[PDB]
Amino acid sequence: QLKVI
Amino acid sequence: AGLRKMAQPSGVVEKCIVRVCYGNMALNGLWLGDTVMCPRHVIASSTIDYDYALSVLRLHNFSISSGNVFLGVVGVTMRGALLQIKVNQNNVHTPKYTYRTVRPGESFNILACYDGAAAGVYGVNMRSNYTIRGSFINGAAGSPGYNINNGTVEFCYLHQLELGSGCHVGSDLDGVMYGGYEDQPTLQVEGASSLFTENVLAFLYAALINGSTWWLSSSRIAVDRFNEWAVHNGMTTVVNTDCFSIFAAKTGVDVQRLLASIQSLHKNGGKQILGYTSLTDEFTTGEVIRQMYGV
């Protein structure tokens, strides 16, 4: 999972 | 009696989960036939040039396993926001499947995976801003979304990212990101989420069928007038109503009365409906019909 602030 | 957010049984999909590792990255893949689909940020090492990452890729740095069985990697290519990884072994448990891109308001199932193994299964509903209300932690990218229709598994989602608000985003199996979000660790504007009105209507009809009527308005409002109101009060427009004919006929309550009850409910969370928040939008008419009547 990537987090896109 | 009763209404619950259910998942279709996951057995047919559990056999298609693999672990996909590259360097210090680990996430989940979907093994169908001799191919493994996974999110492309497994090969990432600020903004990511995926085409460059794929050009420095060596196939022997992958570790793809089904439990304790390791799959040899034959080829990698880019498919939008996904990698298509060709492996040397055919998945004997591959179901009959299709790909489909789901639309706002539609329900599907999430098989949440970690370390290449299913850990949980739950139903979700694609929101108006193309996010789902999920439960994913780091390591769950690649968790598949699916529907089962007449023995065929419809693959519609592979988990990708979580927005800065805790909303979840995936891509369809062609590699098109839902909502157009980018798979980049950046500040991204997330569209406003609205309650999906046609699903609220299905829920309120299920409540009538389950004897819940305290919230029922005597007043009546026309579809096009409610829609004017909806887009200023965080709700989507009503476009399809012919699906409600059977429910109106079973209950005697037409849509226009439900639309007026919806306006009243927005001015109360002062009482539950069937144990739920009064305006829940996670249930479709299709789901309600299957749970109320078995058809």
Next chain:
Amino acid sequence: AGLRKMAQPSGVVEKCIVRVCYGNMALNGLWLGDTVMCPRHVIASSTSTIDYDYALSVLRLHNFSISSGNVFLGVVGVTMRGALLQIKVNQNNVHTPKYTYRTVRPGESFNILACYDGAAAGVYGVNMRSNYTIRGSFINGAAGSPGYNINNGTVEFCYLHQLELGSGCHVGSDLDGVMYGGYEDQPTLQVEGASSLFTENVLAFLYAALINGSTWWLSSSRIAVDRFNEWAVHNGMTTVVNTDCFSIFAAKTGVDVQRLLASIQSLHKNFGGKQILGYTSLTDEFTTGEVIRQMYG
């Protein structure tokens, strides 16, 4: 981030469902080894109080139709196991998982595999209420739907669906055939006990709310366990006695239980149009164990 009621993946259990039909009755059974477990009312010829020992005395083994898919199973013998029938069949289920039985207690969570016509149709998590009912979704034909937890590869079977109370509450028996809550598998008036929110689970849900950044409801103030407990028994909530499973939650948020207990009293009355993780009412369906695996793995 986020919290959802989740089911454990159902693959291992789906291969154990069979369709049990007898006369005008059809429901689901659980095929493990060479035994099929199903609710005993599949052999009931009716309205009035059923005499099950008589029904079993007049049983005609050959009017059973038991099948897994289109594979029909021959019935060898049928005996009563409390509120269940134990049906020995002539074939061993080769996909029988490693399994145990366990009777669950109020406040514990498990998974329902909702079944119809001897096939799994849906899977969802549930939590046993204080009155030994669950908040299910079942219609006619669902009796025999199993409830299960999966621990370390072993399936712990804890529930076979039996009946719906006149209030919509659902009741099953354990795999020993003991009805949960002592309800009778009779088509009669019997009203369920009052149901009190399971406070420990409510705490788990509020800790998860904190972990996910929901904090507007958090009391500045506090209340000791004891002063809370005297308030709980007049307001539909269970008392708390052990606060030690929340230690690790208190450390990861910095918020101790006495602060949440004060939030609970304030939130029991209303949320005031606001929401917590999508909810507008306190919910006791999440256990600390559920929260831990979701928030951390």
Next chain:
Amino acid sequence: IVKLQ
């Protein structure tokens, strides 16, 4: 009132 399902 109790329904055997």
